[PDB]
Structures are given as C-alpha cells and as structure tokens.
Write a protein that binds this ligand. Structure first.
Ligand SMILES: NS(=O)(=O)c1ccc(I)cc1
Ligand SMILES: NS(=O)(=O)c1ccc(I)cc1
Lengths: 262, 296
C-alpha cells in the first residue's frame, strides 16, 4: 500500500532519526531560565492540550507546538507573563504548518482571554520563526508512533490510543522527558501500551528497524511507567480527560499494570 | 541578509503571495530570483504557504530541487532569495513548439525530475503541484523542481491532507474520485503527464472541469475496473454510468516514443496508486540505461 510508502519507509525513518537529533532542545534549559519552571511549562503544555480539543486539532499539531516552545526557550529567556504568548504563537505556527484548516489568528487571541493583543501574537509568531530559523518540520513522537503501529499484527485500536496517550503524558514533564529523543519516548510508549492491553512486548521487527532493544528502552520505560501510575494524581489532567472519550477508546480509564517484568 | 546589496533587474513573475524579481548581488555578481512575500502584520501574519515553502526547502538540498539561498526579514516583508534559473519547462516546450524537443534531452529531464522527486519522497515531502510552469531549466541541461508553495511534509502512513491540490490537468485520478488518503503516487502521476507532454508538446489530459478531466483520462487509458484498479467502483465520486472506453494504444498516444518509453509512461500512469511506479523504481527503468545530460 502506497499510503505506507513501501519504497521510502526506511529512507524516511533514517532521516527522522537524524533530524530529531537536530531539532532537540537543550535538556537543562529550565535551569537557565531565571523566571520560569518545569511546573509553569507543564501548565502551558496542558493548556495547549485543551486548545487542541476546543479547535479539534491534530495531535501532531500539539506535538509540533511543544517542539517549537522547547527550542524557543532553549535560546531565549522569557518572563512568566510572556510564557503564554510564546505558547500561543507556537500553536499558531504548528497549526499553519500542519492543519488543513488552521484557526485564524483571531481565535488564538480569543483563547488567551485577551491576555495579549493580536499584534503581540503576530510579532511573537515572527520572532519564533526567526529563532527557529524556519526549521519547523520537526519529527515528533507521533511520527514514530504511526510508523511503529505498522508492525502490529493485526492493528489494535486500544494499543494505538494508549500509546498516543502515553506519548502526550510525556509532553507535560520536561523533567525527565526532555532527555529522551522522540523515537525513544515513542518506543517506550508503544511497548508499554502493547504490554498493557495484550501482554506482548517490543517487536523484534521494531528492534531491527530502530536498533532499540528493551535494554536500551529500559531507562525511558521506567520513567514512563511511573508517569502512567501517578497519572491520576498529576496536577495536569487535560490529557487524561481527553483520552476518556470514546474517540480514543477510553484508554485513560484503563488501569496501568503494576510491574513491567524487566 | 540585506536588500541593499541586491539590484533589481526585472519582474520575472508574480503570484497570490507576491512578486518574483530577477536580481543581481552587487557585491558577489550572483544573479538571483527574489520572491517578496508581504506580511499581514495586523491580520493573519506569515502565510502558511510561505511557512511550508521555506521550512521544506530548507531541508531539501539536492541538485534537482531549486535552492533557497536566503530568507531576508523586515517587520513588514519577507524576501526569499532563490537561485536564478533561465526559464521554466512550460516556456521551453512552447518555444520548442516547432523545432521539437530532442529525445535525449527529454530523457535527461525526466531522469532528473525523478531524481529530484525521489529525494522529496525520501524526505517525507509531497510536492502536489508538479507541472511544467514549476520546473526550472538552465543553459547547461539541468532541470529542477520548484515552487514548494503547495508542498506538505507527510507522515507514514499518510493521513487526509488538503484535497484542493494539483492543477487539474496534472491531477491524479484518486483525487478526482475523492479518496481520503493520497500519497507519493500523485506526484508520479503528474510527472507521467509531464513526460507525455515533453514528447508531444501538447498537454496529455487538458480538461475544463473535474468530470471532464476523468473522461479525458478514461478515453485514453480505458475506463478502470476492479481487475485493473480494485476499490475503484467503491470510490466516493465514482459513478457506474461512466462509458466503457477501450484503452488507447500508447503508440497512438505518444507516437514518437520507443517501447521502453511507453513502458515507463504506462507504469507512471497506472490507475491503481499502489501499482504505480515509484520515483526510486523509475530511476532503474531501462529507458534510462543510456541517459546523458545534453544542453537545450
Ligand atoms: N528565517 S532565517 O532567516 O533563519 C533563514 C536563514 C536561511 C535560510 I536557507 C532560511 C531561513
Ligand atoms: N517559485 S520559486 O520561488 O521556487 C522560484 C521561481 C522562479 C525561480 I528562477 C526560482 C524560484
């Protein structure tokens, strides 16, 4: 099937792996931000989740926005009262990149509760473009997840949703997740979702695609399992709410497994 | 950069997003094309089409894709600095209208287009607007994909992207019949249509509407069926009334073209997206075993 681009899936994968290294933010940027914190960012990311559901945006769009933000804040000091401006602008750009029918700028000004003017949103848009130098085609967790789903035999909707959901949980917490590449988070998330619903584990065919064994995914798998378990108690819930819906097969209401058996 | 080192030479074109000039770097002598994109600084900001073009071309470094050399910023304008190429394939075919276009030049150009395209697909970029006016040649026998205005970075597997894509004449039949998912093939179709047009110098399927576009393809290639194109009869915009046209002989369709040409063309114009040749595959095709790079 040409929708799985047989003659390119490998060349593409190889490239995303090389490009995800190049779009990677600085792991300890928040330490160097004198006035913003992993918690503040968590609130921002969580709010972007809400925005994505109110405007019915692709999950890829949310992922791109968070990429934009993290790189932006790897390069620019920003005060707390401007954090949201950065967020809004990144979501705007992500939407223009990725959506068939992005929301109008007006709509983005509406959701900050007129915290900012339209003009601030647009000037921040330009600044964010300049900072990133227009390198917007970022490989996301999702872009790896979809490629990994192809190894399922057969596909299971619950595995797909749960892995998507686990991927979005990671967006929220820069510590620890900024230290994992997307393709690593994506794997951990897929292994962990598949283990949960079926009992199976990271396919050997994906080992052969990715070069990632369970040994190599263990650190990330550990962090993510812990996120899954503490998820009901997190300060940020928008993602849990999102994945209660029938749209995503209610995977967030699924109880996590207690041990991963090495 | 700075717009003070550019001396404007002439307007080489225009578009919904701005005017294209030919320019000369006063300091280096380099001749460029400048795309000036106006910024809607109080309303809509930077156009999504520019955001895609710049971002994507920033990633596509290949000798058969047009080179974005720089993006110069103001508060109020964005200037794209491109390599200047002498003309487009459309202009060339129209000027080769009587002399004709030599076969080895056709083969060269197709080969290059396929090399350029295979790079896009290898980098998860659809072009979605291949047509002669978007293909740039120079004086040294080179051709390149240009105008990434309507291009899109894609995921594996693909998802529903904008349907309003590809000039009608170069629009693949899966878009016409209104399917949810399209992929790398839609680009190949276009190049097929381009291949044919380089040979005959007439457009292959010049339709004046959608239903018309479909009829023109079906008369020439035979009305598809479930044994040619499984899934066709269940397509959204499929209509069982379609007349049942006998497939035309490729030696009527493209008389000048050799047996290998006709083979490659047919594989490019396959009804089934899944069976249509890849750019990567087309490069091996025996039509190219003797390719050279002549100058126009
Ligand atoms: N937007 S930017 O000025 O960072 C930029 C620089 C070089 C290229 I090629 C494209 C964009
Ligand atoms: N449309 S575009 O900006 O890719 C372009 C048009 C014409 C030339 I000559 C070079 C580039």
């Amino acid at each position: 099937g040409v929708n799985e681009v047989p003659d390119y899936h490998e060349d593409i994968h190889t490239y995303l792996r090389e490009m995800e290294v190049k779009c990677k933010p600085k792991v300890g940027y928040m330490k160097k931000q004198p006035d913003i914190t992993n918690s503040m960012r968590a609130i921002l990311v969580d709010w972007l989740v809400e925005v994505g559901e109110e405007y019915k945006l692709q999950n890829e769009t949310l992922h791109l926005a968070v990429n934009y933000i993290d790189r932006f804040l790897s390069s620019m000091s920003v005060l707390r009262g401007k954090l949201q401006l950065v967020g809004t602008a990144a979501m705007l750009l992500a939407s223009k990149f990725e959506e068939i029918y992005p929301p109008e700028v007006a709509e983005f000004v509406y959701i900050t509760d007129d915290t900012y003017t339209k003009k601030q949103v647009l000037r921040m848009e330009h600044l964010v473009l300049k900072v990133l130098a227009f390198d917007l085609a970022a490989p996301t967790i999702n872009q790896f997840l979809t490629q990994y789903f192809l190894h399922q035999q057969p596909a299971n909707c619950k595995v797909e949703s749960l892995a998507m959901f686990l991927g979005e949980l990671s967006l929220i917490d820069a510590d620890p997740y900024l230290k994992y590449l997307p393709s690593v988070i994506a794997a951990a998330a897929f292994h962990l979702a598949l283990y949960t619903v079926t009992g199976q584990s990271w396919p050997e065919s994906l080992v052969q695609k990715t070069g990632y064994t369970l040994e190599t995914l263990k650190p990330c798998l550990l962090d993510l399992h812990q996120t899954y378990l503490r998820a009901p108690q997190h300060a940020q819930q928008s993602i849990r709410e999102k994945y209660k819906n029938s749209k995503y097969h209610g995977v967030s209401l699924l109880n996590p497994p207690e041990t991963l058996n090495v | 950069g700075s717009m003070e080192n550019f001396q404007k030479v002439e307007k080489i074109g225009e578009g919904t997003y701005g005017v294209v000039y030919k320019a000369r770097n006063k300091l280096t002598g380099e001749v460029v094309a400048l795309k000036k994109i106006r910024l809607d600084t109080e309303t809509e900001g930077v156009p999504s089409t520019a955001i895609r073009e710049i971002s994507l071309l920033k990633e596509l470094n290949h000798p058969n894709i047009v080179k974005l050399l720089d993006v110069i910023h103001t508060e109020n304008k964005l200037y794209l600095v491109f390599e200047f190429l002498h003309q487009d394939l459309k202009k060339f075919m129209d000027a080769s209208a009587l002399t004709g276009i030599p076969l080895p030049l056709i083969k060269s150009y197709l080969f290059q287009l396929l090399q350029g395209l295979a790079f896009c697909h290898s980098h998860r970029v659809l072009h979605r607007d291949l047509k002669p006016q978007n293909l740039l040649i120079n004086t040294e026998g080179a051709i390149k994909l240009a105008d990434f205005g309507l291009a899109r970075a894609f995921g594996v597997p693909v998802r529903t992207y904008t349907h309003e894509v590809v000039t009608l004449w170069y629009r693949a039949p899966e878009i016409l019949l209104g399917c949810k998912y399209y992929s790398t093939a839609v680009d190949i179709w276009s190049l097929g249509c381009i291949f044919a047009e380089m040979v005959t110098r007439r457009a292959l399927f010049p339709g004046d509407s959608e239903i018309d576009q479909l009829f023109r393809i079906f008369r020439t290639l035979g009305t598809p069926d479930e044994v040619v194109w499984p899934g066709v009869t269940s397509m959204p915009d499929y209509k069982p009334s379609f007349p049942k046209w006998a497939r035309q002989d490729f030696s009527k369709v493209v008389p000048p073209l050799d047996e290998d040409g006709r083979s490659l063309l047919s594989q490019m114009l396959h009804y089934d997206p899944n069976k249509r040749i890849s750019a990567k595959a087309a490069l091996a095709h025996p039509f190219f075993q003797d390719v050279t790079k002549p100058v126009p």
